[PDB]
């Protein structure tokens, strides 16, 4: 029970996260966002203003379809252009549940820590409470917190179209499929941030532009099977450094996918019926 038992969310935070100031422009930030695996930038001088997600990046070329000029604007723009500016954040020596009730609840993917004068000492992502699912009972199986009408997109799709649907529909990976309906891959906003910084970094739209999914997907299908419980799913989320698992039909057609996002929600609930239990 000692994940559990910390004192406060210092256990769990991820220390010297990437952070730039609000002077800063996003040519620094296409560098820096996938530091740590974050996918966040914390943006602060002597206390916190903003975030900087990696959906607030690739937000950049929402309107293009884009020149050498257009990349150069972009690299020069300040952050605070694109930032969430007055990030909600919690304090070092906050606990872990009221942590994960505010991700939940508010649905972010990560929180900023701050000490008591708002300057920022760390960060807590989704996949930092994975390793809470060690010190629990095997309560839920993978099948209760999986989403099943599961948004794909065929292998040949252009990167850009297949960023847009990401962001339209508010997920961070989408499942690849072949001819055949069979998965083939999962292409996620991180494949598509390098891209972009690429693009940004040489001022030459084709490495993203000129791209397909098959091309920069990954590759590695980590499957699970829909009965084994949400504490082996968030086991093999942190030994394969993965955010998702697949869940696939008999004939290689997807049937759901679990993230750390769901594998939150399921901690919430079993946290919450812990303290009923004891009644
Ligand atoms: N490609 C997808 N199709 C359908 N649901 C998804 C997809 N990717 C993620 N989800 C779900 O959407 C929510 C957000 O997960 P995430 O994309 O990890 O932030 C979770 O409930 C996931 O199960």
Redesign the pocket.
Known sequence: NLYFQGMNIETLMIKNPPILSKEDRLGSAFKKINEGGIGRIIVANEKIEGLLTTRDLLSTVESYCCSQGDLYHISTTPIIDYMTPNPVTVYNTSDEFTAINIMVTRNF?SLPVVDINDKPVGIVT?REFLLLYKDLDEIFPVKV???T????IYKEVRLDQAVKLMLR???????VIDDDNKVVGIVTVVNAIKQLAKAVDKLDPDYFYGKVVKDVMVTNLVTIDELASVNRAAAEMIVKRI??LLILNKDNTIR???????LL?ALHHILVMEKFKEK
């Open positions: 993917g989704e917190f999986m989403s009408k599961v948004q794909t529909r508010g997920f961070r990976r989408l499942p955010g998702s759901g996918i679990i993230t750390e996002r769901d929600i």
